[PDB]
Amino acid sequence: PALSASSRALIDEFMSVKQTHAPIHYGHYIIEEVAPVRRILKFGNKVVF
């Protein structure tokens, strides 16, 4: 699976709080990507490993 989200808002929370971000909202979902290569996502200047 590749990192994907149904709305911009879901992604915004995922970056801010990785641990407590809710995977599924009332009408939107977000998938955390799982793969051998762990790429580093650097939106804004908040880094999520």
Next chain:
Amino acid sequence: IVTPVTADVAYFQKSNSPRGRAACVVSCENYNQEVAEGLIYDHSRPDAAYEYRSTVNPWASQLGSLGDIMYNSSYRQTAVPGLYSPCRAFFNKEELLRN
């Protein structure tokens, strides 16, 4: 791949086959095709992965479904062998039996 809207999200958070069933043939007998085919295409029995469901989307798993027609090397003969197909590995029936 065209998919019913309703397919469960829980199927997309884990590494799985893009069709509605898992197609690993390693579990099946080393030298027997029909039982090997029975894993890939038989929906009288639930797939190995999920017991409570036979298939997430029936438009790809089924032998003749939209997914099968578009990506099988059988029907995709007229098309020029120019460009790579990501889905070819998962739908090409011949390759799946090789394992």
Next chain:
Amino acid sequence: NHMNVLVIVDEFYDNKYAAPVTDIALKCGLPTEDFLHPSNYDLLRLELHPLYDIYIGRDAGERARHRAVHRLMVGNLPTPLAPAAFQEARGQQFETATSLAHVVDQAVIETVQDTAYDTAYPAFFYVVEAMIHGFEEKFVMNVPLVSLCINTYWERSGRLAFVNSFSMIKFICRHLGNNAISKEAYSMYRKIYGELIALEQALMRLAGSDVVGDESVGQYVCALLDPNLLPPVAYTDIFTHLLTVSDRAPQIIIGNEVYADTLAAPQFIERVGNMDEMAAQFVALYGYRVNGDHDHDFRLHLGPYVDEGHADVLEKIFYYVFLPTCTNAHMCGLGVDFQHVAQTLAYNGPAFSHHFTRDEDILDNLENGTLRDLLEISDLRPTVGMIRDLSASFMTCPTFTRAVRVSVDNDVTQQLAPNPADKRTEQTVLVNGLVAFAFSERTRAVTQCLFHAIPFHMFYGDPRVAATMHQDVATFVMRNPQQRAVEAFNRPEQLFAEYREWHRSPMGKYAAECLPSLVSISGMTAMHIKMSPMAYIAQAKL
């Protein structure tokens, strides 16, 4: 072979037993969790494509060969792969995209819905509706009568009359507005007409200004804009007009023989004059009933087509979206024995006597008869002059009802298919008959001779309503109570075929369980998009 619908409807339910049910009827009854369980493989094995519904024929003559028939609209999709809440949510997406604003208020829908459920709904207004049959001239001769109808039915109970047909709804809006009917009642009629107009902007709005050839692409986006679809109730000659404008080959089946040629218009179709010109022919038409054979007629009597101009969209929107939503698709096809009706009005005692004044209360002098009984249950008391205005229309009024079946090819986007008959979509049209709310048991005592029940459409075929109208149907549904649902209902092959129809069983299921509220109104509308390569393009932009 026989034109008569009485024999067709009777002989299908006459002595009935175990009744089979279609597959698309079974797939829409199972939830996604249940559909995918490997205890429903019989249902699952057939389905391999989103667009094409597939069935297995009999093994007669050979190994049976599978046939695929295209599902014209989104609403035709199986429920377990598109639940009602999804199409309801998808429809609410359509309102906000095209900037549609609903004219109707929820109060009016409950007002329309509450009329659909009344057994108390009078049967006399039912009789008036049939004798006008959608003519402006005929309707205007009886505006003093219908204004009494709406007046006493709206004031006795806050529920309005004559909502059964679109034509009457149209004239009442166009006419009788100033003072014929009460103001509270009239404004209800305007909104219903207004609501149809508002939707038309939306569907039209959805289709992009752009055109493929000379024609616009609205024909390819929505089923409603597509003119080759027809409203079930026909009173003017739409068919000949259909053959002129249809690029796709159009075939009309009139009994044993169907004519697809315009030059064939004289033999199959006849014309009904404005009742000023037919005056000379008044005597000619009457003898045709007595000494003419109405079976094996293979002719069709219809007024001359009049071009209202909205492409007839507004009538189709009324019949396929508005009515099935507000009434939960509880309505049936009904035909009339017209000469049996006029004999009630004209062979009445009081109407016949010269001595009786034009303005008087008929029920004072009415003799025991079917007309008297109908009036008492309908509790409406009209003057003596009004009956004569209805008796006037006997000279034009058509002899008997007839059902007509249409055969039209799919768009080029939907025509690729192995079989020639598969590219060709079918539809049924009722000639000179009106749709039906539920009948009361008391109502069906003296009214049985006058009307009979015909299941023309899924939206317009209901075991709830049909049983009341026909005795044979009621003992049919009784012995097999499973049939009560609309999808499981059995209709004579001569009249209904679930596979070759614009509205499949899944769409029918949505309306029955569909809510009365306006959100659903936009639900049915958005369910009418075609699932065609140019339907996707239109959808992507919005």
Next chain:
Amino acid sequence: CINTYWERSGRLAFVNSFSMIKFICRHLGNNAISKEAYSMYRKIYGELIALEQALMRLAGSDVVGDESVGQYVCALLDPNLLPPVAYTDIFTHLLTVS
């Protein structure tokens, strides 16, 4: 009886028995009764249909033999269960079909 009892106190008559509730709906649809009191009998009788239709969705479209399975699902849908009050010959109708 009904027109007096409804206006003298905000209550409705003959709600005791089903047959009467049925008749007052088929007949009396004329203004005979007061307008506001009629809709009560209508809703009382209207509800009985929606509760039966809802039970027709519980039992599916499938059938065991000729009969529907609804007989096996709910007690109300069982034709062997009989109402407590009999005014017509339901008993022979029971013997034939059971």
Next chain:
Amino acid sequence: QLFAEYREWHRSPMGKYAAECLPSLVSISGMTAMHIKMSPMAYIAQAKL
């Protein structure tokens, strides 16, 4: 002679419910669902819904 509680369709707890139930519509459906037959045919139907 008129009533034998054990050999009845509606036993005691059906009466205990109606005696205490509130008139509201919630109790209308609550009485309806209490009529399902507790049979294998019932379990199959209740599973599907």
Next chain:
Amino acid sequence: AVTQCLFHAIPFHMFYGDPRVAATMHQDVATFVMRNPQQRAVEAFNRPE
């Protein structure tokens, strides 16, 4: 029909040149409109140059 003797249409302004209104006033604008359904969008209607 009653006002046919007295009044005729003129679509001359973007707000004013309105297709729904025009069809009712003018028979020929109407039948033009019947042939091309989309025109009824006030943005695309075709007024005389």
Next chain:
Amino acid sequence: QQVNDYIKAKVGAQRNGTLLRDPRTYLAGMTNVNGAPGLCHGQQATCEI
């Protein structure tokens, strides 16, 4: 015998039953297993209710 076959078919006990009886079983007294061509997770742990 009809209701017994309806149940055994709505529940699945002929294509997804564990023991798979055919004439070999009752006539000749053997107890064979179902196919289960492949196993994704491992040995099946039966659950008793």
Next chain:
Amino acid sequence: NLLLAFNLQNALKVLCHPRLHTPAHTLNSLNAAPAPRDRRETYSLQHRRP
């Protein structure tokens, strides 16, 4: 690490069998066992026809 739903449809393989729906065995243990409870249900057991 797969999530699996265990709903009523999964348990029909044991819940529909006739072992669940018979009173023969429960009554067998009771009548074989020594003396049962010494209270007694006299009223309303069975219909008495007039």
Next chain:
Amino acid sequence: MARRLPKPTLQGRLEADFPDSPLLPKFQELNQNNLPNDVFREAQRSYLVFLTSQFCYEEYVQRTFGVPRRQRAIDKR
């Protein structure tokens, strides 16, 4: 071909015996050469309905003319 809806209940021979009218003489032209009198009576019943419609249609057209203004000149003067 099969059948027809049942006939509506109406009092027998209501039109002729009950009332006397010009329409009655204009109707006497109809004769019963072949039919059973049962059928003839049924056939006879159908004719007068047609006659009434003609009578009532014409009475409607007379109202459609409006008010004569020449008349409004003389008497109102």
Next chain:
Amino acid sequence: MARRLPKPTLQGRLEADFPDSPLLPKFQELNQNNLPNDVFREAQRSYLVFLTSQFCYEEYVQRTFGVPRRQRAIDKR
């Protein structure tokens, strides 16, 4: 054993005392042979009730007919 509810309150000897009506001849045919006084009075009461109900049903049946068109025309004359 048998049992009935107690009899309602009724003024004794309604027919013989209060009215004189066409039902008296039909009622008087009932005569008591070896019957006690109270039983004969109860029998008479019941038989009068029966005759009254007979008459009321016949009245209702005769009323249910309606108005004849011949007499309506004769009156409109």
